[PDB]
Amino acid sequence: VPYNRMKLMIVGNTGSGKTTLLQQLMGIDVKDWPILVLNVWDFAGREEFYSTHPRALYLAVYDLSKGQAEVDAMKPWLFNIKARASSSPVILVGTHLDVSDEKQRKACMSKITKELLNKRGFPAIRDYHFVNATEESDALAKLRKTIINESLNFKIRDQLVVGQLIPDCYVELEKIILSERKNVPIEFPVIDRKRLLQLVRENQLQLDENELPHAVHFLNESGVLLHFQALQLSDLYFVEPKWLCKIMAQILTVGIISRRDVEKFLSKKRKFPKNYMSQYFKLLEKFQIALPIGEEYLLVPSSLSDHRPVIELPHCENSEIIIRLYEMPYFPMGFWSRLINRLLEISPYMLLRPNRMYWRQGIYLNWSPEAYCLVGSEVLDNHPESFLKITVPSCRKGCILLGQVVDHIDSLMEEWFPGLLLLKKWALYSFNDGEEHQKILLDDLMKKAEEGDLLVNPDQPRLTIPISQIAPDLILADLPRNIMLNNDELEFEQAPEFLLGDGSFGSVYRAAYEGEEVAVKIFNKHTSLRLLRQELVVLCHLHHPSLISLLAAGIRPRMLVMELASKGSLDRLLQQDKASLTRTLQHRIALHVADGLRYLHSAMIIYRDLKPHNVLLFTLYPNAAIIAKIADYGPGFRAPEVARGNVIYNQQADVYSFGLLLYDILTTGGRIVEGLKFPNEFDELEIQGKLPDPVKEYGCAPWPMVEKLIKQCLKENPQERPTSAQVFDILNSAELVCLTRRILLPKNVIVECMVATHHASIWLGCGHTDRGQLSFLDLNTEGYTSEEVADSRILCLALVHLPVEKESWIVSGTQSGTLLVINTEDGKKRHTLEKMTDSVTCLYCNFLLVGTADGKLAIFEDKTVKLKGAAPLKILNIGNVSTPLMCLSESNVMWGGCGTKIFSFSNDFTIQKLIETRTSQLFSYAAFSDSNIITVVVDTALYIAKQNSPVVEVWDKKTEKLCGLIDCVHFLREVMMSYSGRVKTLCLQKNTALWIGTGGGHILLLDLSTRRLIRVIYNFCNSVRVMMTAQLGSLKNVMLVLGYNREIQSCLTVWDINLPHEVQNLEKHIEVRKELAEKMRRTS
Ligand SMILES: Nc1nc2c(ncn2[C@@H]2O[C@H](COP(=O)(O)OP(=O)(O)O)[C@@H](O)[C@H]2O)c(=O)[nH]1
């Protein structure tokens, strides 16, 4: 709809009469003026808004009776206007004509025809008038006509360039919002409830990702409300303009003042939340009201004395100091307060605190007679142009100070006062102490710097000056010793065959430095020096192992010598050698990139470019201290948020980009990268966020943990996405590396036993029901079936393998005592062996050993079990009706548990010793010692776990003695009723790893050679049921951990058998690099 509202900006200096001008025509006094409704902003006082937060017409008002001097005073105002809206209309109005002789009128008339109306650099004043008085006038009638017609003309001009007129149509929903924001009654008008207000007005502009940002954008430009977009009080805090302006302006007027006393006053004036108060102070900085000095003080630039304090500097002879001048036509408004804010952080030691003084128009830092710094404004007669003077003592520390000052000045101007980049840079020098200084432009000194000569007096050759004294910042004399270029080491040709690449900065060649391969950036005639120094500032102070460091810089040919990558960029590797891209290598690359991001984010630097083309590899050797680095720190791969082209980049954009990188790493084919070849789908795909399952879609081997990390990372909402610090923490995990698969079982399925086929599937029992039900899991497809095969509940399964006969059978022992034997190659071949006198408690198989609940051990001949109703070879009575067999271990002598005794068997099935373990109660606790044995692990000692024990007993089988206890509670006691500490199962690996499962979701990794805790693996599931060691169909060895996850959920987790080693190796890796980070940062 045809929006017909436009802003009127009235500017001028204090005492101009501009408010009364407005009155008759009809910090900032804001009121509507229906004529066309104008939103009139009367900048009554020094409202910095015109620089702190700069469809509008400008009315420039000045006092004619003051004259030409006032006209000149308006140049900064005009500059500022042009600097933010050169296309906007400007009407120049002189006032006080009734007390100003026409001499002044025509003097100022000629003044503006000579210096503003026909002068570039000012926003082409559209028209002008002179007014006698605000009583009324024909001049004012004409002015009103001018304002109206010109504002119409302006919007016509916008239609010619922008495409919008004074009835330009804007989405009506935005118009509605304006009205909704008008209707707001809040004591402390700070808005967050806007989300609700959207919901109050039905739900308009529902594209929160696009329409909402546009509405907000409009709301600031249209003069309705205020976002403050890196502040915390920014996005969710929309504030009434009247309060923002009023309160901050008042506090200025309510010069060093302690923060706390300001807080005291403010708390009485307006009871803001202390959180808001911290932001309040931050706003004072950003709006140039007050600058932070120490953490307890504010400078308050405005109102500082403007009578440069008497300062006597040490050093007096011309050769003792260095002087630099900046010639300007006028200082921009706010130039000084911004400059001061930057200069306050200067320090010659950053590579005692200074006695600082403030002039408003200058800063004096003291430190020491050895190194001090004075920056301030000075003006000479017959030279209208104002200008800066910088003075430092001529020595290395003085140089360092100078470098910092001029870098801040140039950066200030590039960001805030472009257009000037005027700024005539002069250096002062003399050929003899006691004489006057001579001026020279730095451009000419640069011409001489290229020659490398002394500055030579053209009239008298005997008089020369070593350039460095005049300009030690043209020659890079302020570099750290560590990066000064040694010209006897650097070896390069600049020949075509060494060209590695180029750009707007010049070109890059391959070279040698101190015997190493390096890359040399050359600033080949591209506004050099300034670009060079900008790069030097960024490169220094960033010293992380994952970044490309600087290996000396040199002004003689203007070079940056940097580290050259040995294996090249990731992108190439992805497309050229998947064999190198092992699972181990991939993980390490992810760590190194994550560190770089964490570091740069803590350094307040947004990378904005994470793609495979930017990742450099320095060795494919998986176990190296440094593998990947991020290039050039300081396309279709964009976050969907920033892809809109209407928001601001931040760490969350980088995080999203990282997630995509990780996705690209996961699928080593670079399948989405191949998608780039069809960019119309590729860029949109990323925008949609609808990425396909990396496993299913590309045929990529499973990698859980990472898979969910990517999903967690790539969220649509920036506030939901993980921080880069968190991303790293997640990547820093042995579990991440070694977890390979996780299969959930169907709801309400309880498996009490497992048999993996050693040849890729698992036979599962089922204790959920009370019926003999046998299930089956296909690891190749994660397929699952199940059928009832027996009456009573299946207790134990065993695999009979007869490779000689080319067949195998599953033996199912159950509660009834029967043995159901089923051919694995033929489900129809089912038969039952001689029924046992009690239930079957365990199976082992060659002989099929059947341990029953009455302590009886049946031994069946290897092949015999094929026949239905077959009887055992022999039967032994070990225990009794109350002492069941529960474990047959063998690692050809058997060992096992019977009640509280440990038995052992020969190859003739004779008892070789009955070790009563009840005597262990002399140690530990009798109710733990006196309990049925659950499992026996046979190594160089026996490891016994008893039912409901928290302690594992270690026995010396050679002497039958207790040789130690393992307290599981203790280990988890060190870890900060899920912590039952009950031991569930014991597995043993011959590399000394001992795997102990427990009641809660924890797995302890112990070191058998020292009996020490390697690591606690936890938050696995609710409870661990069984653990198996099994070789996969790929021949890879893994742990099969079956657990409960009560919602009776249960699941199978597959772990890489080398977990114990990965835990230790990873830990080492992380620590080594940690030390290197400190090494680098400390050198500086
Ligand atoms: N002689 C004369 N004085 C004026 C005229 N316009 C404004 N002034 C005086 O200027 C004062 C208004 O200043 P004001 O606009 O409040 O101050 P400012 O906002 O800082 O410029 C009143 O005293 C006016 O009488 C005029 O046309 N003729």
Ligand SMILES: [Mg+2]
């Ligand atoms: Mg006023």
